[PDB]
Structure formats: structure tokens, C-alpha cells
Design a protein around this ligand. Structure first.
Ligand SMILES: CCCCCCCC/C=C\CCCCCCCC(=O)O[C@@H](COC(=O)CCCCCCCCCCCCCCC)COP(=O)([O-])OCC[N+](C)(C)C
Ligand SMILES: CCCCCCCC/C=C\CCCCCCCC(=O)O[C@@H](COC(=O)CCCCCCCCCCCCCCC)COP(=O)([O-])OCC[N+](C)(C)C
Ligand SMILES: CCCCCCCC/C=C\CCCCCCCC(=O)O[C@@H](COC(=O)CCCCCCCCCCCCCCC)COP(=O)([O-])OCC[N+](C)(C)C
Ligand SMILES: CCCCCCCC/C=C\CCCCCCCC(=O)O[C@@H](COC(=O)CCCCCCCCCCCCCCC)COP(=O)([O-])OCC[N+](C)(C)C
Ligand SMILES: *[C@@H]1O[C@H](CO)[C@@H](O[C@@H]2O[C@H](CO)[C@@H](O[C@@H]3O[C@H](CO[C@H]4O[C@H](CO)[C@@H](O)[C@H](O)[C@@H]4O)[C@@H](O)[C@H](O)[C@@H]3O)[C@H](O)[C@H]2NC(C)=O)[C@H](O)[C@H]1NC(C)=O
Lengths: 181, 83, 174, 73
């Protein structure tokens, strides 16, 4: 039951937005909880090396699951924070994550020539061009953010599906045999 | 330690209160910022083209004023949290 | 008390999941004290698993709240039913009230000033759509606080009354 | 570390002045903040050096006497 509870918390990091800044806190501390619970499992289960038990396989599956979630969360966070200037958006990522993801679309946005007077005029113009450049950078930043958000929506469903499926594959092979017996 | 965590949660609730979320009551503000800090320690052709500029300037000025009021009440909540 | 923490503080996970870690430490504490038989479950193990499920559910609901709070105002549009339920109806029942009651040279200057004005208007509109999502998150966090309090009280009372009313028999042989 | 005085133009001029004084006060407050920031950075540097020195001194002095005694006998 604790292994199941730690397994269900593994994919929930993919429902955590990146702008919260607490995605890796959740994942790494679930890993810490698993690592501390490893002491409980070692204290409780037999320490035998003739064969891997079903509990051992489930513990390893849970651990590898948490490691994979950590790795993929780091990939997601890296994708979220891609700078518009240094990292140009490739066309294939745009096609595969802004165009070909049209499934759930609750989303959107898929004579007075004094020097002082002329300097004031130029400064107002400069202010406007500055804000324009800031908006243009923010648009591409938000494009990368949209891509990371789409990746997180896909991977949440993927990870919850794997959490159900691997647990069933670990335990049903013996539970069905016991039901038949 | 449990009570201190509860106190920290309450203090962080006090710190991050916002004008668009909570109302700063005058008795509360006067208690936590004055009493307790002391206890503890022609002319229309031109106007046809200048009217958008004047209206936009007034809008920018009002936007700055509203943002400053927002910020000032934010520091007021922060000072209450510190007290 | 994690549900009373603001989302802007960025400390909901660091509290709830560390409470889960402490609960794992106490599971290690009891690992060498309880009987190892399988005919029944000790009531203290029932209580510990209940508390762990409670903390696990606090993490889940906190993640839902933070997803609502940090929701992009532009790429996520409010459904009308969310606006109807979590802004107008449930705040009245939960005791929450939103304070909001709802020449060639001069032509370049004019265009620039209008551009600043339009950009600032867009900023206000985006801000409004942001506070709508944030208020929905706060309301969903006050509701979850109340249901968490109810579930905690009911389960703890049930388990503690089961424990306390288990008396020794007054007769050695019924 | 011409004379076109009108109630809406005067508001724009006064508000432009208000904007300038606003970012003037903000700059002053910001600079006063960077002063404390510079102070905290200086204590960080000093205490980095102090703590590495104390770490070396504790790794040495606790183990120094018994290691040299074993070297000698
Ligand atoms: C690992 C398997 C997955 C590899 C993903 C590689 C693509 C993602 C990637 O490079 O993003 C990051 C690693 O993202 C990571 O997750 C890197 C992890 C490497 C160390 C893993 C140790 C465990 C690094 O991104 P980048 O190198 O700054 O990106 C440059 C452009 N490029 C992605 C075309 C290279
Ligand atoms: C378990 C945690 C994950 C749930 C995921 C639900 C689906 C999802 O992705 O988010 C949805 C949450 O649906 C809403 O838009 C409403 C959110 C709830 C508001 C009220 C909460 C009341 C809680 C009780 C009181 C919105 O998804 P989307 O914005 O339509 O984007 C498509 C996402 N997809 C491709 C994965 C479908
Ligand atoms: C709220 C959540 C946390 C609070 C309770 C904690 C769970 C433990 C618990 O009380 O066990 C519960 C569920 O335990 C089971 O898992 C059911 C037992 C069947 C196991 C697998 C069946 C196939 C109840 O225990 P039980 O297993 O139903 O034991 C009663 C049956 N017996 C006494 C005849 C054996
Ligand atoms: C130790 C506990 C100490 C509790 C009292 C001290 C803190 C009180 C407090 O701020 O209450 C908090 C938590 O309120 C609760 O969570 C109340 C229930 C706590 C115990 C639950 C046992 C079950 C807030 O409760 P509230 O009802 O949201 O109070 C209005 C706050 N408001 C003005 C921001 C909307
Ligand atoms: C602690 O453990 C003890 C066992 O280790 C428990 O003792 C048992 O208690 C039950 C209930 O009191 C007894 O069962 C009763 O037995 C009497 C006598 O049965 C005999 O006489 C009848 C006469 O008609 C006959 O039909 C039977 O076959 C017997 O010859 C019955 O009259 C009762 O209806 C009932 O069945 C057990 O016998 C007794 N066991 C022993 C070994 O003493 C004790 O109750 C436990 N204490 C607790 C739980 O607090």
C-alpha cells in the first residue's frame, strides 16, 4: 500500500505547472520517501538472493518509475525555460506540438528644434520600440511554454496509465492463478 | 514545532494578501503598524490629432497610479506580516 | 494547514510531502514493534495508513490548486460553468468575498503614445484573466480545506472511538 | 556600491511629472536596497573563508595528535 501511494504521486508532477517552481521538490522528495521506505521493506521482507520476489519487482518498478519521472520532468523544465534568442524554435516541434495536438482544445493561442525637445521625442520613440521588443521576445517564450505544457498533459496520462498497467502486470499473473486454484 | 509551522502558515497568509483578494481593515492596519511595532520595539485640427495622445497619456498616468497603490498596500501587508 | 498556505508562497509541496516523509519515518519506527501475523490488521497500522492516505490526498489537492493558480490566462480560457460555480455561488457559502466590485515629428509621438496605451490595456486585460483563475484557485482551496477538516475529524474520531471502547471482559469465561 | 490651456492637457503634464518623480523615488529606494545587498555579499565572502578555515582546522586538530603519536610510536 505505501508503494502504491508513492507510485500514484509520481505522475502528479506532470500536473504541476513549471511556473510554480515546486515540480522538482515534489519529485525528489517522493524519491526521498521511497528511499526511506526502503529501510522498512528491508527490515520486513526476507533477504534472499535465489530469485527476485514479486515485492522486489514491484519496488524496482516503483523506483525506476520515479527515476523516469525525474528525468522527464527535468526535460520538461528545460523545455519550458528555453530562451527565445539563444534557442530558435524548430519547425518540427512546432508542427508536432502546436499543430498536430488538436485533440482537447480547451487551450488557445495555440520652429522648436531645440536639442532637448528632439531628445524627448527620440526617447518616447525608444520607449515604444523597447516595449515592442519585449513583447516580441515574450511571444516566443510563451510558445516554448505552450510546448512544455502540451508535453506535460501527454505525460500525465502516460504516467498514470503506466502506474496502473505495471502494477496490474506485476500482481495479476499470480492473483489470477490463485483465483483459479 | 507544529505550532510554529502553523504560525508560519498564518504569517505567509498575511504577507501575500493582495488588494484584489483581501481588504485591509483600518483597525487592523492601525493595530499592527502603529501600536504593536512600538510595544515590541483653429485649435481643433490640432486637437483632432492630439486628442489620442492626451487620452493615452492620461491612461498611462492612471495605470502608474493604480500600480503604485497596489504596491503600497502590498508593502503594508508585508509590514503587518513582519510585525 | 497546507490549504491555508498561499499559492504564491511556493511551499505547499515542501510542507505536505515532507509530512509524508515524516510519516514514513514513523512507519520505520513501528516496523520493529507490531506483530507480523496476517489474521488481522492492527488498529494503529490502520490509523497510520489512514494518515498516509490523508497526506497523499493533501498533496493531490494541493497540486490541483497550484495548477489552477498558475494557469496561463491566454492559453486556458475559463468555461462558463467554472465562472458560475466558483466565482458567484460558492464564495457566498464559503465566506469569501472578492474586493473587486466589477507635422511628421509629432505623428510618431502620437503613434508611440497610443502604442504604450494599447499595450497597457492588454496588460490590464491579461491581469484580469489572471486574477479570475487565482480566485477560482483560492475558492477551490477553501473548499478543500473544509472537506479535509471534515474527513480528518470523521476518520480520526471513528478510529479513536474504536480504540477507546475496546475494554477487557469483566468475565474470564463468557 | 498658441495658448491651449485646457483641463485635460494640464492633467497630462502633471502626470508626466508624477511619473518622473515616481521612478526617481524608485531608483533611490532600489539603490538603498543594493547597499544592504552588497553588505550581505561581503559577509558571505568573509564567512565562506572563515568556515573553510574552521573546517580544515577541525579536520586537522581533532586527528593531529593521535596521528603524529602513531607516526612516532
Ligand atoms: C536521458 C534520456 C533523455 C535525453 C533527452 C535528450 C533531448 C532533450 C535535451 O537535450 O534536453 C536537455 C537534457 O535533457 C535531459 O533530460 C538530459 C539528461 C541527460 C543525463 C541523464 C542522466 C540520468 C538539454 O537540452 P540542450 O542540450 O540545452 O538543448 C539543445 C538542443 N537539442 C535538444 C537539439 C540538443
Ligand atoms: C487528477 C488531476 C488531473 C486531472 C486532469 C483533468 C484533465 C486535464 O488535463 O485538465 C482539465 C481540467 O479541467 C478543467 O478545465 C477544470 C479543472 C477543475 C476546476 C474545478 C475543480 C473542482 C475540484 C472539486 C471541487 C483541463 O484540460 P484542458 O485545459 O482542456 O487541456 C486538455 C488536456 N488534456 C489533453 C489532457 C485533456
Ligand atoms: C482508508 C485507507 C487506510 C485505512 C485502512 C488501512 C488498510 C488496512 C486495513 O484495514 O485492511 C482492510 C482492507 O485491507 C485489504 O487490503 C483487504 C484485504 C484483502 C487483501 C487482498 C485481497 C485479494 C480491511 O482488512 P481485511 O483485509 O478486509 O481483513 C478482514 C478479513 N479477514 C479478517 C478475514 C482477514
Ligand atoms: C493548532 C490549530 C490552531 C488553530 C487556531 C489558530 C489558527 C486559526 C486560523 O488562522 O485558522 C485558519 C485555519 O483554520 C483551521 O484550520 C481551523 C481548524 C484547525 C484544527 C482542525 C482540527 C480537525 C484559517 O481559518 P479561516 O476559517 O480561513 O479563517 C479566516 C481566514 N481568512 C480571513 C483569511 C479568510
Ligand atoms: C479465554 O480463553 C478460554 C479458552 O482458552 C475461554 O474459555 C472458554 O469459554 C467458553 C465460553 O465461556 C467455554 O464454552 C462454554 O462451555 C460450556 C461447557 O461446555 C460443556 O458442558 C456442556 C453442557 O451442556 C456440554 O454440552 C459441552 O460439550 C461441554 O462438555 C458450555 O455450557 C457453554 O455453552 C460454552 O460452550 C469454553 O469451554 C471455554 N474453554 C475452556 C478450555 O475453558 C475464555 O472464555 C476466554 N476468556 C475471554 C475470551 O475473556
Amino acid at each position: 500500500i505505501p508503494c502504491l501511494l508513492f507510485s500514484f504521486l509520481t505522475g502528479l508532477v506532470f500536473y504541476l505547472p513549471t511556473d510554480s517552481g515546486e515540480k522538482m521538490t515534489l519529485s525528489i522528495s517522493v524519491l526521498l520517501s521511497l528511499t526511506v521506505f526502503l529501510l522498512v521493506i528491508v527490515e520486513l521482507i526476507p533477504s534472499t538472493s535465489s530469485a527476485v520476489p514479486l515485492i522486489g519487482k514491484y519496488m524496482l518498478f516503483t523506483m525506476v518509475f520515479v527515476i523516469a519521472s525525474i528525468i522527464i520532468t527535468v526535460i520538461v523544465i528545460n523545455t519550458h525555460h528555453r530562451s527565445p534568442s539563444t534557442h530558435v524554435m524548430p519547425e518540427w516541434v512546432r508542427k508536432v506540438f502546436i499543430d498536430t495536438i488538436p485533440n482537447i482544445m480547451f487551450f488557445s493561442t495555440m520652429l522648436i528644434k531645440h536639442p532637448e525637445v528632439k531628445s524627448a521625442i527620440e526617447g518616447i520613440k525608444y520607449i515604444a520600440e523597447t516595449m515592442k521588443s519585449d513583447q516580441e521576445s515574450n511571444n516566443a517564450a510563451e510558445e516554448w511554454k505552450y510546448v512544455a505544457m502540451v508535453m506535460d498533459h501527454i505525460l500525465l496520462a502516460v504516467f498514470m496509465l503506466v502506474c496502473i498497467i505495471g502494477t496490474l502486470a506485476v500482481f495479476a499473473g499470480r492473483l489470477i492463478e490463485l483465483n483459479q486454484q | 514545532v507544529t505550532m510554529v509551522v502553523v504560525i508560519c502558515v498564518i504569517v505567509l497568509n498575511i504577507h501575500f494578501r493582495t488588494p484584489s483578494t483581501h481588504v485591509l481593515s483600518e483597525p487592523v492596519k492601525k493595530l499592527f503598524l502603529e501600536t504593536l511595532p512600538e510595544i515590541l520595539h483653429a485649435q481643433q485640427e490640432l486637437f483632432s490629432e492630439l486628442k489620442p495622445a492626451v487620452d493615452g497619456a492620461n491612461f498611462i498616468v492612471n495605470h502608474m497610479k493604480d500600480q503604485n497603490n497596489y504596491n503600497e498596500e502590498k508593502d503594508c501587508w508585508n509590514r503587518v506580516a513582519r510585525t | 494547514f497546507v490549504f491555508y498556505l498561499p499559492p504564491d508562497a511556493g511551499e505547499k509541496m515542501g510542507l505536505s510531502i515532507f509530512a509524508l516523509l515524516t510519516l514514513t519515518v514513523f512507519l520505520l519506527l513501528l516496523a520493529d514493534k507490531v506483530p507480523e501475523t496476517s489474521l488481522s490488521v492492527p488498529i494503529i497500522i490502520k490509523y497510520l495508513m489512514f494518515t498516509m492516505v490523508l497526506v497523499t490526498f493533501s498533496v493531490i489537492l494541493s497540486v490541483v490548486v497550484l495548477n489552477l493558480h498558475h494557469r496561463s490566462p491566454h492559453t486556458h480560457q475559463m468555461p462558463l460553468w467554472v465562472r458560475q460555480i466558483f466565482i458567484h455561488k460558492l464564495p457566498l457559502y464559503l465566506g469569501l468575498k472578492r474586493p473587486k466590485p466589477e507635422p511628421p515629428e509629432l505623428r510618431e509621438v502620437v503613434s508611440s503614445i497610443s502604442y504604450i496605451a494599447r499595450q497597457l490595456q492588454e496588460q490590464e486585460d491579461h491581469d484580469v484573466l489572471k486574477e479570475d483563475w487565482q480566485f477560482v484557485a483560492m475558492v477551490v482551496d477553501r473548499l478543500f480545506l473544509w472537506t479535509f477538516i471534515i474527513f480528518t475529524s470523521v476518520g480520526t474520531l471513528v478510529i479513536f472511538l474504536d480504540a477507546t471502547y475496546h475494554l477487557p471482559p469483566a468475565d474470564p469465561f463468557p | 556600491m498658441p495658448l491651449i490651456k485646457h483641463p485635460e492637457v494640464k492633467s497630462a503634464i502633471e502626470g508626466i511629472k508624477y511619473i518622473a518623480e515616481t521612478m526617481k523615488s524608485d531608483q533611490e529606494s532600489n539603490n538603498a536596497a543594493e547597499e544592504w545587498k552588497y553588505v550581505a555579499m561581503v559577509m558571505d565572502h568573509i564567512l565562506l573563508a572563515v568556515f573553510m578555515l574552521v573546517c580544515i582546522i577541525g579536520t586537522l586538530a581533532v586527528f593531529a595528535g593521535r596521528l603524529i603519536e602513531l607516526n612516532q610510536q
